Design a protein around this ligand. Sequence first.
Ligand SMILES: O=C1NC[C@H](CO)[C@@H](O)[C@@H]1O
Ligand SMILES: O=C1NC[C@H](CO)[C@@H](O)[C@@H]1O
Ligand SMILES: [Ca+2]
Ligand SMILES: [Ca+2]
Ligand code: NA
Length: 432
Amino acid sequence: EDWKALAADVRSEFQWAWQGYVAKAWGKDEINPVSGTSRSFFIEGHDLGLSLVEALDTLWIMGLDAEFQAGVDWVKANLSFDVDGNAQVFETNIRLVGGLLSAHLASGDPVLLAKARDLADRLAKAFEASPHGLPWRYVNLRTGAVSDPETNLAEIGTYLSEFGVLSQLTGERKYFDMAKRAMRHTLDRRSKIGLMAANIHAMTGAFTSRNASIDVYADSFYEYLWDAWALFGDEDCKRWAVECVDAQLAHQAKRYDGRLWFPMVDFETGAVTGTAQSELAAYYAGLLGQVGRKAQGDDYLASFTYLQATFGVIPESIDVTTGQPRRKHTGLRPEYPDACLNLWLIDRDPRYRRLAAIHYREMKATSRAAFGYTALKDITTRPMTQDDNCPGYWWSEQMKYYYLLFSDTPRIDYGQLQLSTEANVLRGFRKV
Ligand SMILES: O=C1NC[C@H](CO)[C@@H](O)[C@@H]1O
Ligand SMILES: O=C1NC[C@H](CO)[C@@H](O)[C@@H]1O
Ligand SMILES: [Ca+2]
Ligand SMILES: [Ca+2]
Ligand code: NA
């Protein structure tokens, strides 16, 4: 395989998709690339240029400089967060705060930092509304009013990378501290077997379920422990990352039909409490490698490789007891090449490139639409039927992962590269 040629194809396809966004959805949150229309993501009828923001670091890394600058210039002229509407704190941080930060780090443009910080200050109100510092799920961007305290580990614990970078750049430790305090809350309440339930109440500070998970509602909490060690040298986070993964390997790792899975378990007793695994769990194969459990990470990756070989597109959810789909639609999901990149950064094994190339080519074969790339309706029909949405994360995640895996671009210091859970580059840009 000529990896450089494949990288050039990824770049060409990304530029083509960008052109569709400009033509049909300029300044809007998401393109619906089958109909050639747009939709809002955070606040209905008050778009915040989501996909444009998500795309920026990807554009820069690919050397799509005119496109990058057009997006940055749109942000500088147009993007405001003084909006009387409710935004989901978690999504707003990982997509918009993180997307502005990566664009700031690539370009050096102070305005992008000013806007990231303005947004983080609006989100901070959600943390301040809890006596525990656990953020409420929604906040009014203008007024600070909060709603829905019945939250989860991912939505209380996927801030430290973006907030910590804000603290580094601004000099104000308050961001780092607020994010770390929320994670410490649940870690301090681990069971005797070292697990946390995934569901937590922001006001009582108590768990609201008994289910420990590595999967949706928890996932990126575990990443951000490791990532805070990597980015900030935080010794507590290093310890916690390893402890949490050790507990998961002891109590959640189970084999079904010869394949490794991590079903949900009772956080105190370790009894299996669910049989589903989502596609989104594939991130964990990469995290396992990062924390020094690479053999287990490769074993887990292999479970998803099997799903890809069997089903073409990895099912959005599977039953681990049968290895078959629980849902037929998809979200055009990036977690398989996420894992491939993260494991490849350890040893540079070309196997990961081969696996990611399958994934990219399958994306082209299934999700291509008139004006971009779309999520799927039914992976079981041939052809697979399509829905009509390009999720914002596509612009930050899988095209970037493919390009990083194939390009060996001089724009990134691969030894220093750090990616958020939304693939925002938070370290490793090499000035041109
Ligand atoms: O981002 C995704 N959907 C939202 C979940 C948190 O509620 C999160 O865990 C998942 O990765
Ligand atoms: O961590 C998150 N999970 C869900 C999305 C990707 O599927 C994206 O928002 C991010 O990766
Ligand atoms: Ca992620
Ligand atoms: Ca990660
Ligand atoms: Na991005």
